[PDB]
Design a protein around this ligand. Structure first.
Ligand SMILES: Cc1ncc(COP(=O)(O)O)c(/C=N/C2(P(=O)(O)O)CCCC2)c1O
Ligand SMILES: Cc1ncc(COP(=O)(O)O)c(/C=N/C2(P(=O)(O)O)CCCC2)c1O
Ligand SMILES: Cc1ncc(COP(=O)(O)O)c(/C=N/C2(P(=O)(O)O)CCCC2)c1O
Ligand SMILES: Cc1ncc(COP(=O)(O)O)c(/C=N/C2(P(=O)(O)O)CCCC2)c1O
Ligand SMILES: [K+]
Ligand SMILES: [K+]
Ligand SMILES: [K+]
Ligand SMILES: [K+]
Ligand code: NA
Ligand code: NA
Ligand code: NA
Ligand code: NA
Lengths: 431, 431, 431, 431
């Protein structure tokens, strides 16, 4: 059982609480698209752990490689090179778009974002950063200064030069030009305001291709491209945060690949390490070169460690080989359809959005009003869990709560169906 | 060979440079107190990788556990608990001093420091942070704002409310009270200045028990304790950064254990993960409780992931079981003695300092003057490498460069001797 | 003549340049609505000096009082009270709206704004300030941090916590709700963005009732009132900057009197000192009381100096007695009509706006396009000067340049006509 | 009488309290070295109003000039030049040292300091400012960020990049080098710390030649000069704040004249306007030129207003003509001697310091201990007042309270004697 008093006792005595609430169970094992509690109950992992496990849990390939390096080459002095590093770095230059030539291998997403940010600041010699008002980039310093979906309060001033502008949001639009949502005019209007506040030290814009924590918000048609133009015009880098969208989750190796818009720095992590702590940034040779001339420094314990590098390489391998970017499209499409059927069935479902296997479902109380349904989302979620489906809903000011659905790229069709089912039941049972 | 042109070519085309210079070799394997290049040359790892591998490389225990969890329980949604987490958290409450009750399990040292810092800020409701002027806490946001040994330049304003005061440094003292180094009066004098600059929002003081990157600078007798008193008097937390001093490196599980001075938050990482990416903070139940009331948030992909948790637990186990804190004292003492013999032999050796197996050697040009010997340090280092001993020297304004010597806690006596020897030769050959 | 080489020589050798360009003449005397050059040429002062002389130049009443105190009571230790101070302070409590009870007497407008701002910060215990994106509050610290019409660049970071939102601008509207300019919805939309960026430390909103330097932009119907509501809802003070709108310039003693919306702090200066250096802030007894409890401090050399206090009292007197707030309405109305006739005559005149004797004229190249007419404004201005009429045009990104017309409240009708004429000619001659 | 209830009533209802406490009297007139209450009691003004009236109160010369311009040329558009301006600007280039060529004419001391500071920032392109830990520069933005004697608390973050270092203080020394106060080594030591905290954006150092509000602290022999060297070495401007030391108060036109060390920008105000609101900054032609190239802007209502300019010119005149810088030396010396006699008489007098007519008297409880005498200072002061001598004591952490004695440069010998007497009595009567 899940009731080990000792377990819960220590848990209560010795854990720092760091947000949300602990799931009332004890996970004892995980494999593929499931986790198993202490009763051996199998739980369908519709979020791939914390939105990371694209290969699923305990992937035999990973398990293989992990072992190899653990026993062969684990960790080294940060000034020593090894093959996994150069290989992974090289693979990355290779699978990313053109213009992305050199990589730096780290440990976390926020870390990856801090590296990028520091780099833009170094090469521009400026420090003002602009993000979206519903963004998430990490808990640390700079990444946190640019995160607006949450965390801004009660912990001192943000970094000097922090700005946000609204994310283009088709589902809940607020900028009309001629009786229609002109999100491109919204962008302009936001930028002028920014331009008016700047001290003249705009260094970069950071953006998630699809805002996840922000409620699965997809940058609409040509926005990304217009955005790059705002940056270029201002002598700013555009940094694309692909912690969750990267590595084939949206059914392209990299989301930025869909818009055909290549950023100045691309950051990776969650899906790169597929559950393990490995991250990276990728920049142009020109940018890398100037950073270097200017003395760029981003030296850590784990930068360039062989074991993690090895793990990411294997992940990229397996993804490539097992043709998982496409599987994300197939399954995603299988899932969307189901979500849309449910939506047919249930009025509380106000929106089915997202891409590939990064889908979002927006719970509303009234389709015409899109009145957020209060408590309803929490219910569905509670219910999914009982029914044995791990889910995640995010709730920001102004919108219905959103289910963030992101199963493993390796998920099966039945697993999808199974999931779609538990969900159907959870909603039925929650109304 | 180490000349694989392809290797070096890609390395040149695809790596972002992030500080220092790449060692001209290709590390192909590592085991125990050695790394091996592409020729199979065995290199004596006198820094335990990047000052992390207390168990040495590829420790069979680690290799065991790594495998287990990789294939059993890897990564989970951050709201799900599992045993390694609670166990490690519990172990930590247990082996740390009194007053340290609850832990948070993360991925990196800077991450660990950011968590701590944010926590102090949350509970004090203030934001000014004070560190030592030769500190190192990480590359990220807040950790970087409090790092003064380097990195402050060319990357925008530091965080609002950043201060430093000089570290008590016996080897090179600058505050005299009655014809003697009154480092305790220095502390007072520094604090008054701080008090005069504060906006009245002093939240914490952060400190390394022994400044490593800063040149193996040990806080002298009663300083730590006086320091805690400065904090207490100001309503500030004292955060102790034990990324490298922790986990028995200085011959106590935790350096703060030596002074009998327990901090408000203790951070751990490097030696905790023993090469793997795992970190932690530990605080009092009272502090944890208030943080929680105030909504403390520090939510990451890898917080509470079972695999890393598992790895740290095993590390603590093995350290305990194999009685490595003591081995650090034995070996350390074996090494110090040798360093002191060399010092007898060579005048360029102006100082042998540090504790346990965290020793520092300060290169000078003249003992009477303690004139830093220019280029000499770099030479010795170059030479050690040829002789097959990996070394690390750090150089700050005002001092001779310092060798940071920190072999694995598992190192053998011959390995020590061997090392002491290569060093003797490197110096001979460098003069 | 105006060519005194010596004069111009020294002027060139010994003056720090501080913006704009020096008028090529030498002002030798001033009286009423004119200044006279070194040739004795009379220049019609359509801006009342630097938008200050509501009584005109060298007002006999002022000249009287100035003398009195100069020879009777000039300057005192800031802890000594005298009658002019208490009288003026009292007069102010008396003529200002309800809710405004206590005054602080200073020297400059920026000074007045800094006092207010510091006060809001003290009583809220917060520090984030929000202004309009085309505002002007002064050159100093905080006033400059909240000034967005200009000056933000090349002089370091602005104050921590600085924000702006767009000013409601009917002439050039950019926020449409249902095929119309919903400036009230714009306000909401701006505030949400602000709310999303705040660290949770919103202390105040500062605003000019009519943006002058910003291009004579009048807050439209009910905006001010909605704004106050944004502040109230957020626990923020609303500070109204009436440096130029105050003291009857807009045909009400205080512009805020028109909307029937009373701010938490009101600041005064330009028109208060009527050319002399005297300023003030006025707050509620409740606010004053709390500031005091919290130790409010704003101690200067000239706070509470009798001479200036005396001068302002006399100004208020004379304004009252000579019924100048009304004269501002009469003359203003006389002037608007003329401006509108010109507008009839000339297409380059795209807008006649403002209130009382604070009128603005927006030069455009095409009425349909409202394309700013480039160089045209500068011409008209040059021409006015030749014709003997001192004018002022302000030019911000996105708009035609604007003439800021603000003659003395004491101006005569013929003087108005005269002015309207020189202008008619200047435009004719500039096309 | 001083009891006008109405007076006190309104005073209570309508005055914002802004620091300290109101003197319980009603000043009705002032002339020469006295102010007179409502009973006609004559009070000996030992602080020249708020340390401003070098000509004394209601100086007939001033009264003359004030009238002239009031009725002739008062205030103008900031782009119009007139003779008083150019004349005063020229006079200033003339009486100041070499290297000081161009002036900017403003209204207040803080204003003057903000102009200077902004200028340094513009020309260095940097923003970090360093001052003394017991400084006073003004209540506004930047001036307040650099003021450390008080005001730092409860009003938000200071400006980004604010630093202080300790002022060299012979009376109460805390840095010993070889059994002696090495204040020059203190300076070095402070600067290294600063160097370690800087983001590499040191723009200027600001300093009062003698810290007044800070307790009449005179920069010792060669310090100023060493300081200039710190700045030069760092590419920083040295800005000298001479609000009170300037204009012959210390018995040199400008205190910096004594050390033969000329700053990059010199600011003036208090004694320049001799009670009226007029200030100025003076810089080198080279600096002015570069500021200008870079677009320097510091545009105010009262910059370059003829009336105030006129008043300062007259002040400089009269000072020159009436040979008041020397009178400051004579009288000062007359006063010091008396203070030293008192000191002979009373043990509570621990220190007689200062220069010219800017003397300070430090009250202590024990000469050997220099234990600040608590309440004693306040007593003496209370007593002086009863005896009819207006005095001012300032009290900072760590020192006895200090009387700041600064009578008019025009003061007479008997007036000095008279003062020395009331003081003798006040102390007698306070013990
Ligand atoms: C006290 C402390 N706290 C946090 C950190 C940072 O942890 P991490 O960079 O992994 O986040 C470190 C990192 N130490 C070094 P080092 O091992 O060579 O001394 C990593 C490369 C240069 C600094 C550290 O000493
Ligand atoms: C775009 C992006 N960048 C960096 C990060 C941070 O990476 P990390 O916290 O590991 O440093 C994240 C983290 N995402 C979450 P999520 O998976 O539930 O959305 C981690 C828990 C709450 C935010 C992220 O989405
Ligand atoms: C060196 C310096 N610079 C600027 C200023 C500020 O000028 P102002 O406040 O008029 O702007 C001052 C003000 N001095 C006092 P003081 O005369 O009692 O010492 C004004 C009341 C308390 C501080 C000053 O000493
Ligand atoms: C609303 C407001 N608040 C404070 C101030 C500043 O007061 P001051 O500069 O005297 O401190 C001003 C100054 N206005 C001008 P203007 O008269 O030409 O518009 C001074 C020259 C350019 C800006 C102002 O409009
Ligand atoms: K490494
Ligand atoms: K996790
Ligand atoms: K005063
Ligand atoms: K002017
Ligand atoms: Na590429
Ligand atoms: Na413990
Ligand atoms: Na009123
Ligand atoms: Na000169």
């Amino acid at each position: 059982l899940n009731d080990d008093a000792t377990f819960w006792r220590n848990a209560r005595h010795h854990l720092v609480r760091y947000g949300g609430t602990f799931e009332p169970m004890i996970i004892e094992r995980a494999k593929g698209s499931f986790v198993y509690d202490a009763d051996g109950r199998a739980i369908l992992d519709f979020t791939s752990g914390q939105m990371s496990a694209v290969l699923g849990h305990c992937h035999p390939e990973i398990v293989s490689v992990i072992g190899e390096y653990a026993g062969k080459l684990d960790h080294l002095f940060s000034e020593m090179l090894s093959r996994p590093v150069v290989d992974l770095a090289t693979r990355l230059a290779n699978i990313t778009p053109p213009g992305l030539d050199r990589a730096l291998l780290l440990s976390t997403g926020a870390e990856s974002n801090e590296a990028a940010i520091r780099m833009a600041k170094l090469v521009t010699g400026k420090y003002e950063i602009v993000g979206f008002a519903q963004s998430w980039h990490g808990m640390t310093g700079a990444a946190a200064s640019a995160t607006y979906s949450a965390g801004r309060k009660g912990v001192g001033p943000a970094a000097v030069g922090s700005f946000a502008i609204p994310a283009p949001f088709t589902y809940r639009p607020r900028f009309e030009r001629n009786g229609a949502y002109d999100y491109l005019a919204e962008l302009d209007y936001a930028f002028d305001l920014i331009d008016r506040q700047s001290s003249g030290n705009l260094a970069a814009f950071i953006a998630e291709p699809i805002l996840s924590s922000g409620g699965i918000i997809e940058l609409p048609d040509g926005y990304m491209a217009a955005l790059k133009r705002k940056c270029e015009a201002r002598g700013m880098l555009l940094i694309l945060d692909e912690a969750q969208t990267g590595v084939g989750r949206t059914g392209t190796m990299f989301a930025c690949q869909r818009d055909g818009v290549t950023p100045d720095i691309l950051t990776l992590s969650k899906t790169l390490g597929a559950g393990l702590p490995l991250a990276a940034i990728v920049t142009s040779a020109a940018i890398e070169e100037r950073a270097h001339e200017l003395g760029y420094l981003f030296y850590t314990t784990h930068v360039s460690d062989p074991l993690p590098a090895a793990v990411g390489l294997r992940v990229l391998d397996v993804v490539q080989r097992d043709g998982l970017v496409a599987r994300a499209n197939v399954m995603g499409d299988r899932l969307r359809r189901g979500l849309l059927d449910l939506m047919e069935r249930f009025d509380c479902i106000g929106d089915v959005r997202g891409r590939g296997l990064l889908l979002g479902v927006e719970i509303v109380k009234d389709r015409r009003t899109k009145e957020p349904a209060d408590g309803l989302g929490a219910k569905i979620t509670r219910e999914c869990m009982n029914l044995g489906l791990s889910m995640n809903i995010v709730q920001l000011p102004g919108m219905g709560g959103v289910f963030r659905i992101a199963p493993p790229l390796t998920v099966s069709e039945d697993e999808i169906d199974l999931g779609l089912s538990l969900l159907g039941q959870a909603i039925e049972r929650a109304l």
